[PDB]
């Protein structure tokens, strides 16, 4: 009853993962820079949204409500410039509704929580 036998063809298509963005310590430094670049309103409450990446995320980041999804879309690229050349799409989970519109604020999108997972675009 060996559990390592045979094979099953791939579930999906090829995923172009490179992770050529330097040692994760550099990623953390750039994430800190981007976080400091986030303008905290000081009035509306603050929430930490953690993000999952294909290779692995866990990128916890505090945020506000007045911002737009464009804010996170830009912050992710700042912390991961390699994503600048690689278009990214963010979707919630259960339902896995794709988050398309960016002009809507986080309050408008009522997404103040960790349903931020990255998929290839």
């Amino acid at each position: 009853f060996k559990a390592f036998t045979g094979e099953g063809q791939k579930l999906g298509s090829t995923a172009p993962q490179v992770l050529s963005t330097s040692s994760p310590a550099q990623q953390a430094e750039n994430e800190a820079k981007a976080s400091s670049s986030i303008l905290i309103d000081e009035s509306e409450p603050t929430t930490n949204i953690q993000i999952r990446l294909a290779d692995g995320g866990r990128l916890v980041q505090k945020f506000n409500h007045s911002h737009r999804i464009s804010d996170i879309r830009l912050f992710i690229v700042d912390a991961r410039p390699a994503m600048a050349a690689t278009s990214f799409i963010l979707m919630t989970t259960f339902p896995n509704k794709e988050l398309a519109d960016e002009s809507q604020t986080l309050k408008e999108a009522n997404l103040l929580n960790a349903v931020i997972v990255q998929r290839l675009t």
Binding site: A3, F4, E7, G8, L11, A54, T92, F94, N96, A114
Partner: protein, 433 residues
């Protein structure tokens, strides 16, 4: 302790969602869509995802049947929940089917059931978990034997899934999901809640009644086929109470003395398995009206039933329930205080009830986009749960017979029932009430 929560039924039918109250979510610092490592009774661990629910008490945690069984936990128990951010995208995940449900079913159990269920949803998974996948008008179970990150894992579009066939046998500790559950009954939600409030505490916390009266007789009545037996079976299953079915015709078939002995031994056995539930099906068949009975042996058996039921008083934690059509259907002195002192009216399911029953019976069925159960449920006047099940089965049969003109699980899942099939079955409904 904040992590301690009382299990409760889940409205969300998804197999991997745990509903919690928003106050409790924020108090626990749990963000919807995050993984959680539930701790069961016998060191059982279930990895699921938390979701907010306004209609949920803070201590109450709503769960699906599958997760409950995976944790070997029943409603009203206490479970520990904590975030488990340490989840990796496992690559090698080995899942196997269960023989008792895939027998006579051919075609690779992938691209048919496993593939659509997983796809890209990122369903969390733990080693040894059991989950149910619906398709091809059948509910196939699967056991997660191994995962690349031992033991917790989450499927990913880059995860490699191995399904090497060879269905595994069901171990006795595990309780098959084919058994009736609280979600298998629709329409009589009010009566079902009444039954919970009536019988849950004696069975779940017997020590309280032995120390600190309890209801001993519940008379379920209504048109035949309304699922009364279904109700009793479900109740027994969630409360973990021994179930003993005493079919009225079975007793009446036995000759004089043999029938009374059988009834007596059934009660004694049920008593020896306390806590237990005795379902006296078709009670009118055993104890009809005084005018209807015209035989010494029947009056003797009725007297014997009354004497045994009275003897139940010195016994305890044994609940006897029976099925009939109307209280006046059975002879008097059976509704006297004590014996069958409580009554419940299942009645006929309403439009919402019929919709719920149809959904329950069509879970495995693949219906076309044009098929809408609400419109038909509105049309289906005076149908009993048995009638609704038969109607759905007839529509399925119509679709299958139509396709035969042109078993492989792929072919089975390929065909889908259409609204025309439902309309045709409707024309052949033959209502019973």
């Amino acid at each position: 302790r904040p992590n301690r929560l009382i299990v409760d039924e889940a409205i969300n039918e998804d197999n991997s969602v745990v509903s919690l109250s928003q106050p409790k979510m924020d108090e626990l610092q749990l963000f919807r869509g995050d993984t959680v490592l539930l701790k069961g009774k016998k060191r059982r661990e279930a990895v699921c995802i938390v979701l907010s629910d306004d209609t949920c008490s803070d201590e109450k945690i709503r769960m699906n049947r599958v997760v409950r069984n995976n944790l070997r936990v029943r409603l009203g128990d206490v479970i520990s929940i904590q975030p488990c951010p340490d989840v990796k995208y496992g690559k090698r995940i080995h899942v196997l089917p269960i023989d008792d449900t895939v027998e006579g079913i051919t075609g690779n159990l992938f691209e048919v059931y496993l593939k659509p269920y997983f796809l890209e949803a990122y369903r969390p998974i733990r080693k040894g978990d059991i989950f149910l996948v619906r398709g091809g008008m059948r509910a196939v179970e699967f056991k997660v034997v191994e995962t690349d990150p031992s033991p917790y894992c989450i499927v990913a579009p880059d995860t490699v899934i191995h399904c090497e066939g060879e269905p595994i046998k069901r171990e006795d500790e595990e309780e098959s999901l084919n058994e009736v559950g609280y979600d298998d009954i629709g329409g009589c939600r009010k009566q079902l809640a009444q039954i919970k409030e009536m019988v849950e505490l004696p069975l779940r916390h017997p020590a309280l009644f032995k120390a600190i009266k309890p209801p001993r007789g519940i008379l379920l009545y209504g048109p035949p086929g309304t699922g009364k037996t279904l109700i009793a079976r479900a109740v027994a299953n969630e409360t973990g109470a021994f179930f003993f079915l005493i079919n009225g015709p079975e007793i009446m078939s036995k000759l004089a003395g043999e029938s009374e002995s059988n009834l007596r031994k059934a009660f004694e056995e049920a008593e020896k398995n306390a806590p237990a539930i005795i379902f006296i099906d078709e009670l009118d068949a055993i104890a009809p009206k005084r005018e209807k009975t015209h035989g010494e042996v029947e009056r003797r058996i009725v007297s014997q039933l009354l004497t045994l039921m009275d003897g139940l008083k010195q016994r305890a934690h044994v609940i006897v329930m029976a099925a009939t059509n109307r209280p006046n259907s059975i002879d008097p002195a059976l509704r006297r205080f004590g014996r069958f002192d409580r009554e419940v009216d299942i009645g006929i399911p309403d439009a919402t009830g019929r919709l719920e029953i149809l959904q329950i019976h069509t879970k495995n069925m693949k219906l076309a986009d044009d098929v809408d159960l609400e419109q038909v449920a509105n049309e289906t006047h005076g149908h009993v749960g048995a009638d609704l099940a038969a109607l759905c089965s007839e529509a399925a049969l119509q679709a299958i017979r139509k396709k035969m003109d042109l078993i492989d699980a792929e072919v089975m899942n390929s065909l889908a029932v259409t609204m025309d099939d439902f309309r045709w079955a409707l024309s052949q409904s033959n209502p019973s009430a």
